[PDB]
């Protein structure tokens, strides 16, 4: 019961960070491996200003990590809890089915 | 070799993903709430009534009814009555799998 409240708060904080169509798209792409910002901006329909904000949100939530290789910025999953949620709501569509 | 249907089968479709992402986005929006999440966990064990939910959770004497109504308007819970007994159940199988994933092990 008191353990439920602790689990409920951590879970809801995780779902809050994932309850966004654009962010969910980024997670899915990153489920198939590390990808750069231009790769995601190329794949994602919306404007690149929205992509970088969604990336910044996923990063400050600890749900993705980044690294720089010169002028390139690469992003990867960095959270096993979020990967399982993404895997569940997509029904392994990002795994390649 | 080189068929359209074949190279399409092997290529992940970004717009089918967009369709799934929006539906999953709406599902997580309905669940990204601590109070509603706790209701979902209790209902994952089985059918439970409103007053035994208010008994078990007790966020406040009126917040359970508010969160139950919102879970119902989103299609995640179901309602039925036997006189003085309102029986609520987990109606959406997609939400059940999300609850099972985040509550790895806790409800059922
Ligand atoms: Cl937006």
PDB file of C-alpha atoms and ligand atoms in Angstrom:
ATOM      1  CA  UNK A   1       0.000   0.000   0.000  1.00  0.00           C
ATOM      2  CA  UNK A   2       2.698   2.462   1.025  1.00  0.00           C
ATOM      3  CA  UNK A   3       4.962   0.665  -1.444  1.00  0.00           C
ATOM      4  CA  UNK A   4       2.231   1.224  -4.040  1.00  0.00           C
ATOM      5  CA  UNK A   5       2.403   4.995  -3.577  1.00  0.00           C
ATOM      6  CA  UNK A   6       6.170   4.961  -4.144  1.00  0.00           C
ATOM      7  CA  UNK A   7       5.844   2.793  -7.257  1.00  0.00           C
ATOM      8  CA  UNK A   8       2.873   4.829  -8.505  1.00  0.00           C
ATOM      9  CA  UNK A   9       4.783   8.115  -8.321  1.00  0.00           C
ATOM     10  CA  UNK A  10       7.866   6.811 -10.130  1.00  0.00           C
ATOM     11  CA  UNK A  11       5.721   5.129 -12.789  1.00  0.00           C
ATOM     12  CA  UNK A  12       3.562   8.212 -13.358  1.00  0.00           C
ATOM     13  CA  UNK A  13       6.672  10.388 -13.635  1.00  0.00           C
ATOM     14  CA  UNK A  14       7.915   7.992 -16.316  1.00  0.00           C
ATOM     15  CA  UNK A  15       4.608   8.027 -18.202  1.00  0.00           C
ATOM     16  CA  UNK A  16       4.461  11.834 -18.039  1.00  0.00           C
ATOM     17  CA  UNK A  17       7.828  11.995 -19.800  1.00  0.00           C
ATOM     18  CA  UNK A  18       6.557   9.578 -22.478  1.00  0.00           C
ATOM     19  CA  UNK A  19       2.977  10.876 -22.965  1.00  0.00           C
ATOM     20  CA  UNK A  20       3.812  12.815 -26.125  1.00  0.00           C
ATOM     21  CA  UNK A  21       3.453  11.679 -29.732  1.00  0.00           C
ATOM     22  CA  UNK A  22       6.637  13.360 -30.954  1.00  0.00           C
ATOM     23  CA  UNK A  23       8.731  12.091 -28.047  1.00  0.00           C
ATOM     24  CA  UNK A  24       7.277   8.589 -28.447  1.00  0.00           C
ATOM     25  CA  UNK A  25       8.428   8.688 -32.077  1.00  0.00           C
ATOM     26  CA  UNK A  26      11.967   9.545 -31.018  1.00  0.00           C
ATOM     27  CA  UNK A  27      12.055   6.658 -28.495  1.00  0.00           C
ATOM     28  CA  UNK A  28      10.913   4.241 -31.203  1.00  0.00           C
ATOM     29  CA  UNK A  29      13.604   5.353 -33.639  1.00  0.00           C
ATOM     30  CA  UNK A  30      16.202   5.113 -30.873  1.00  0.00           C
ATOM     31  CA  UNK A  31      14.973   1.608 -30.018  1.00  0.00           C
ATOM     32  CA  UNK A  32      16.682   0.418 -33.222  1.00  0.00           C
ATOM     33  CA  UNK A  33      20.012   1.924 -32.132  1.00  0.00           C
ATOM     34  CA  UNK A  34      21.877   5.173 -31.633  1.00  0.00           C
ATOM     35  CA  UNK A  35      20.953   7.982 -34.022  1.00  0.00           C
ATOM     36  CA  UNK A  36      22.124  11.532 -34.627  1.00  0.00           C
ATOM     37  CA  UNK A  37      20.067  14.716 -34.493  1.00  0.00           C
ATOM     38  CA  UNK A  38      20.074  15.230 -38.265  1.00  0.00           C
ATOM     39  CA  UNK A  39      19.058  11.588 -38.747  1.00  0.00           C
ATOM     40  CA  UNK A  40      16.029  12.158 -36.513  1.00  0.00           C
ATOM     41  CA  UNK A  41      15.288  15.564 -38.043  1.00  0.00           C
ATOM     42  CA  UNK A  42      15.361  13.833 -41.439  1.00  0.00           C
ATOM     43  CA  UNK A  43      13.011  11.048 -40.320  1.00  0.00           C
ATOM     44  CA  UNK A  44      10.587  13.224 -38.339  1.00  0.00           C
ATOM     45  CA  UNK A  45       8.015  15.266 -40.238  1.00  0.00           C
ATOM     46  CA  UNK A  46       7.672  18.185 -37.813  1.00  0.00           C
ATOM     47  CA  UNK A  47      10.010  21.173 -37.716  1.00  0.00           C
ATOM     48  CA  UNK A  48      13.502  20.735 -36.298  1.00  0.00           C
ATOM     49  CA  UNK A  49      12.817  23.307 -33.573  1.00  0.00           C
ATOM     50  CA  UNK A  50      10.234  20.923 -32.112  1.00  0.00           C
ATOM     51  CA  UNK A  51      12.588  17.941 -32.477  1.00  0.00           C
ATOM     52  CA  UNK A  52      15.359  19.539 -30.414  1.00  0.00           C
ATOM     53  CA  UNK A  53      12.921  20.535 -27.660  1.00  0.00           C
ATOM     54  CA  UNK A  54      11.543  16.989 -27.503  1.00  0.00           C
ATOM     55  CA  UNK A  55      15.122  15.707 -27.390  1.00  0.00           C
ATOM     56  CA  UNK A  56      15.980  18.151 -24.600  1.00  0.00           C
ATOM     57  CA  UNK A  57      12.897  17.011 -22.677  1.00  0.00           C
ATOM     58  CA  UNK A  58      13.743  13.319 -23.057  1.00  0.00           C
ATOM     59  CA  UNK A  59      17.312  14.095 -21.969  1.00  0.00           C
ATOM     60  CA  UNK A  60      16.484  16.163 -18.877  1.00  0.00           C
ATOM     61  CA  UNK A  61      14.099  13.354 -17.892  1.00  0.00           C
ATOM     62  CA  UNK A  62      16.998  10.894 -18.103  1.00  0.00           C
ATOM     63  CA  UNK A  63      15.136   8.978 -20.811  1.00  0.00           C
ATOM     64  CA  UNK A  64      17.892   9.505 -23.430  1.00  0.00           C
ATOM     65  CA  UNK A  65      21.613  10.265 -23.383  1.00  0.00           C
ATOM     66  CA  UNK A  66      23.765  12.179 -25.850  1.00  0.00           C
ATOM     67  CA  UNK A  67      27.364  12.384 -27.023  1.00  0.00           C
ATOM     68  CA  UNK A  68      29.197  14.637 -29.470  1.00  0.00           C
ATOM     69  CA  UNK A  69      31.504  13.559 -32.311  1.00  0.00           C
ATOM     70  CA  UNK A  70      32.760  16.846 -33.725  1.00  0.00           C
ATOM     71  CA  UNK A  71      29.692  18.635 -35.084  1.00  0.00           C
ATOM     72  CA  UNK A  72      27.459  15.550 -34.728  1.00  0.00           C
ATOM     73  CA  UNK A  73      25.273  14.839 -31.693  1.00  0.00           C
ATOM     74  CA  UNK A  74      24.237  11.204 -31.197  1.00  0.00           C
ATOM     75  CA  UNK A  75      21.319  10.082 -29.018  1.00  0.00           C
ATOM     76  CA  UNK A  76      20.555   6.713 -27.418  1.00  0.00           C
ATOM     77  CA  UNK A  77      18.017   5.128 -25.094  1.00  0.00           C
ATOM     78  CA  UNK A  78      19.695   5.388 -21.645  1.00  0.00           C
ATOM     79  CA  UNK A  79      16.684   4.141 -19.631  1.00  0.00           C
ATOM     80  CA  UNK A  80      15.528   0.498 -19.439  1.00  0.00           C
ATOM     81  CA  UNK A  81      12.194   1.381 -17.803  1.00  0.00           C
ATOM     82  CA  UNK A  82      11.199   3.654 -20.689  1.00  0.00           C
ATOM     83  CA  UNK A  83      12.372   1.096 -23.256  1.00  0.00           C
ATOM     84  CA  UNK A  84       9.985  -1.468 -21.770  1.00  0.00           C
ATOM     85  CA  UNK A  85       7.074   0.995 -21.825  1.00  0.00           C
ATOM     86  CA  UNK A  86       7.809   1.956 -25.436  1.00  0.00           C
ATOM     87  CA  UNK A  87       8.122  -1.738 -26.289  1.00  0.00           C
ATOM     88  CA  UNK A  88       4.726  -2.367 -24.668  1.00  0.00           C
ATOM     89  CA  UNK A  89       2.681   0.465 -26.192  1.00  0.00           C
ATOM     90  CA  UNK A  90       4.121  -0.220 -29.658  1.00  0.00           C
ATOM     91  CA  UNK A  91       3.755  -4.011 -29.254  1.00  0.00           C
ATOM     92  CA  UNK A  92       7.363  -4.510 -30.399  1.00  0.00           C
ATOM     93  CA  UNK A  93       6.753  -2.551 -33.618  1.00  0.00           C
ATOM     94  CA  UNK A  94      10.113  -0.800 -33.122  1.00  0.00           C
ATOM     95  CA  UNK A  95      11.850  -4.167 -32.501  1.00  0.00           C
ATOM     96  CA  UNK A  96      11.071  -4.943 -36.140  1.00  0.00           C
ATOM     97  CA  UNK A  97       8.010  -6.960 -35.052  1.00  0.00           C
TER      98      UNK A  97
ATOM     99  CA  UNK B   1      14.462  -9.550 -56.177  1.00  0.00           C
ATOM    100  CA  UNK B   2      13.701  -5.870 -55.729  1.00  0.00           C
ATOM    101  CA  UNK B   3       9.930  -6.190 -55.508  1.00  0.00           C
ATOM    102  CA  UNK B   4       7.944  -3.292 -54.124  1.00  0.00           C
ATOM    103  CA  UNK B   5       6.010  -5.458 -51.671  1.00  0.00           C
ATOM    104  CA  UNK B   6       9.286  -7.072 -50.594  1.00  0.00           C
ATOM    105  CA  UNK B   7      11.409  -3.989 -49.927  1.00  0.00           C
ATOM    106  CA  UNK B   8       8.339  -2.524 -48.196  1.00  0.00           C
ATOM    107  CA  UNK B   9       7.966  -5.527 -45.880  1.00  0.00           C
ATOM    108  CA  UNK B  10      11.622  -5.158 -44.850  1.00  0.00           C
ATOM    109  CA  UNK B  11      11.382  -1.366 -44.357  1.00  0.00           C
ATOM    110  CA  UNK B  12       9.866   0.034 -41.167  1.00  0.00           C
ATOM    111  CA  UNK B  13       7.046   2.409 -42.125  1.00  0.00           C
ATOM    112  CA  UNK B  14       7.362   5.804 -40.434  1.00  0.00           C
ATOM    113  CA  UNK B  15       3.683   6.642 -40.939  1.00  0.00           C
ATOM    114  CA  UNK B  16       2.349   3.422 -39.429  1.00  0.00           C
ATOM    115  CA  UNK B  17       4.591   4.336 -36.473  1.00  0.00           C
ATOM    116  CA  UNK B  18       3.058   7.816 -36.441  1.00  0.00           C
ATOM    117  CA  UNK B  19      -0.400   6.244 -36.225  1.00  0.00           C
ATOM    118  CA  UNK B  20       0.660   3.952 -33.377  1.00  0.00           C
ATOM    119  CA  UNK B  21       2.478   6.799 -31.612  1.00  0.00           C
ATOM    120  CA  UNK B  22      -0.632   8.987 -31.462  1.00  0.00           C
ATOM    121  CA  UNK B  23      -2.812   6.196 -30.064  1.00  0.00           C
ATOM    122  CA  UNK B  24      -0.120   5.260 -27.533  1.00  0.00           C
ATOM    123  CA  UNK B  25       0.330   8.958 -26.716  1.00  0.00           C
ATOM    124  CA  UNK B  26      -3.361   9.267 -25.843  1.00  0.00           C
ATOM    125  CA  UNK B  27      -3.182   6.100 -23.738  1.00  0.00           C
ATOM    126  CA  UNK B  28      -0.199   7.313 -21.702  1.00  0.00           C
ATOM    127  CA  UNK B  29      -1.778  10.756 -21.233  1.00  0.00           C
ATOM    128  CA  UNK B  30      -4.735   9.033 -19.565  1.00  0.00           C
ATOM    129  CA  UNK B  31      -2.410   6.990 -17.323  1.00  0.00           C
ATOM    130  CA  UNK B  32       0.262   9.614 -16.494  1.00  0.00           C
ATOM    131  CA  UNK B  33      -1.357  10.415 -13.148  1.00  0.00           C
ATOM    132  CA  UNK B  34      -0.365   8.952  -9.788  1.00  0.00           C
ATOM    133  CA  UNK B  35      -3.908   8.739  -8.422  1.00  0.00           C
ATOM    134  CA  UNK B  36      -5.332   7.153 -11.563  1.00  0.00           C
ATOM    135  CA  UNK B  37      -2.343   4.803 -11.717  1.00  0.00           C
ATOM    136  CA  UNK B  38      -3.119   3.502  -8.231  1.00  0.00           C
ATOM    137  CA  UNK B  39      -6.714   2.805  -9.232  1.00  0.00           C
ATOM    138  CA  UNK B  40      -5.432   0.847 -12.239  1.00  0.00           C
ATOM    139  CA  UNK B  41      -3.173  -1.277 -10.055  1.00  0.00           C
ATOM    140  CA  UNK B  42      -6.016  -2.193  -7.696  1.00  0.00           C
ATOM    141  CA  UNK B  43      -8.298  -3.036 -10.628  1.00  0.00           C
ATOM    142  CA  UNK B  44      -5.525  -5.147 -12.170  1.00  0.00           C
ATOM    143  CA  UNK B  45      -6.002  -7.612  -9.308  1.00  0.00           C
ATOM    144  CA  UNK B  46      -9.671  -7.930 -10.243  1.00  0.00           C
ATOM    145  CA  UNK B  47     -13.049  -6.254 -10.099  1.00  0.00           C
ATOM    146  CA  UNK B  48     -13.335  -3.798  -7.207  1.00  0.00           C
ATOM    147  CA  UNK B  49     -16.110  -1.468  -6.064  1.00  0.00           C
ATOM    148  CA  UNK B  50     -15.969   2.293  -5.556  1.00  0.00           C
ATOM    149  CA  UNK B  51     -16.283   2.322  -1.774  1.00  0.00           C
ATOM    150  CA  UNK B  52     -13.657  -0.404  -1.356  1.00  0.00           C
ATOM    151  CA  UNK B  53     -11.432   1.675  -3.631  1.00  0.00           C
ATOM    152  CA  UNK B  54     -12.012   4.749  -1.456  1.00  0.00           C
ATOM    153  CA  UNK B  55     -11.345   2.405   1.477  1.00  0.00           C
ATOM    154  CA  UNK B  56      -8.020   1.126   0.138  1.00  0.00           C
ATOM    155  CA  UNK B  57      -6.620   4.286  -1.433  1.00  0.00           C
ATOM    156  CA  UNK B  58      -8.204   7.298   0.337  1.00  0.00           C
ATOM    157  CA  UNK B  59      -6.481  10.125  -1.496  1.00  0.00           C
ATOM    158  CA  UNK B  60      -9.578  12.165  -0.487  1.00  0.00           C
ATOM    159  CA  UNK B  61     -13.300  11.517  -0.153  1.00  0.00           C
ATOM    160  CA  UNK B  62     -13.951  13.086  -3.588  1.00  0.00           C
ATOM    161  CA  UNK B  63     -10.749  12.600  -5.603  1.00  0.00           C
ATOM    162  CA  UNK B  64     -11.342   8.878  -6.207  1.00  0.00           C
ATOM    163  CA  UNK B  65     -14.694   9.591  -7.873  1.00  0.00           C
ATOM    164  CA  UNK B  66     -13.080  12.282 -10.038  1.00  0.00           C
ATOM    165  CA  UNK B  67     -10.245  10.011 -11.178  1.00  0.00           C
ATOM    166  CA  UNK B  68     -12.651   7.113 -11.774  1.00  0.00           C
ATOM    167  CA  UNK B  69     -14.846   9.294 -13.992  1.00  0.00           C
ATOM    168  CA  UNK B  70     -11.818  10.426 -16.008  1.00  0.00           C
ATOM    169  CA  UNK B  71     -10.602   6.842 -16.422  1.00  0.00           C
ATOM    170  CA  UNK B  72     -14.113   5.923 -17.593  1.00  0.00           C
ATOM    171  CA  UNK B  73     -14.452   8.827 -20.035  1.00  0.00           C
ATOM    172  CA  UNK B  74     -11.109   7.738 -21.523  1.00  0.00           C
ATOM    173  CA  UNK B  75     -12.411   4.181 -21.943  1.00  0.00           C
ATOM    174  CA  UNK B  76      -9.942   2.523 -19.562  1.00  0.00           C
ATOM    175  CA  UNK B  77     -12.424   1.383 -16.888  1.00  0.00           C
ATOM    176  CA  UNK B  78     -15.922  -0.058 -17.020  1.00  0.00           C
ATOM    177  CA  UNK B  79     -18.872   0.409 -14.685  1.00  0.00           C
ATOM    178  CA  UNK B  80     -21.781  -1.708 -13.484  1.00  0.00           C
ATOM    179  CA  UNK B  81     -24.181  -1.626 -10.549  1.00  0.00           C
ATOM    180  CA  UNK B  82     -25.988  -4.110  -8.296  1.00  0.00           C
ATOM    181  CA  UNK B  83     -28.194  -1.911  -6.127  1.00  0.00           C
ATOM    182  CA  UNK B  84     -25.910  -0.239  -3.577  1.00  0.00           C
ATOM    183  CA  UNK B  85     -22.751  -1.640  -5.220  1.00  0.00           C
ATOM    184  CA  UNK B  86     -20.911   0.080  -8.080  1.00  0.00           C
ATOM    185  CA  UNK B  87     -18.464  -2.446  -9.552  1.00  0.00           C
ATOM    186  CA  UNK B  88     -15.508  -1.108 -11.555  1.00  0.00           C
ATOM    187  CA  UNK B  89     -13.235  -3.227 -13.749  1.00  0.00           C
ATOM    188  CA  UNK B  90     -10.230  -2.713 -16.013  1.00  0.00           C
ATOM    189  CA  UNK B  91     -11.730  -2.472 -19.505  1.00  0.00           C
ATOM    190  CA  UNK B  92      -8.797  -1.586 -21.791  1.00  0.00           C
ATOM    191  CA  UNK B  93      -6.284  -4.402 -22.417  1.00  0.00           C
ATOM    192  CA  UNK B  94      -3.704  -1.891 -23.678  1.00  0.00           C
ATOM    193  CA  UNK B  95      -3.802  -0.032 -20.358  1.00  0.00           C
ATOM    194  CA  UNK B  96      -3.556  -3.360 -18.514  1.00  0.00           C
ATOM    195  CA  UNK B  97      -0.275  -4.167 -20.266  1.00  0.00           C
ATOM    196  CA  UNK B  98       1.110  -0.688 -19.546  1.00  0.00           C
ATOM    197  CA  UNK B  99       0.201  -1.052 -15.868  1.00  0.00           C
ATOM    198  CA  UNK B 100       1.799  -4.506 -15.785  1.00  0.00           C
ATOM    199  CA  UNK B 101       4.968  -3.087 -17.363  1.00  0.00           C
ATOM    200  CA  UNK B 102       5.453  -0.124 -15.010  1.00  0.00           C
ATOM    201  CA  UNK B 103       4.216  -2.118 -12.001  1.00  0.00           C
ATOM    202  CA  UNK B 104       6.610  -4.891 -13.022  1.00  0.00           C
ATOM    203  CA  UNK B 105       5.196  -7.257 -10.529  1.00  0.00           C
ATOM    204  CA  UNK B 106       3.115  -5.441  -7.971  1.00  0.00           C
ATOM    205  CA  UNK B 107      -0.571  -5.720  -8.833  1.00  0.00           C
ATOM    206  CA  UNK B 108      -0.838  -9.102 -10.579  1.00  0.00           C
TER     207      UNK B 108
HETATM  208 CL1  LIG C   1       4.061  19.713 -29.840  1.00  0.00          CL
END
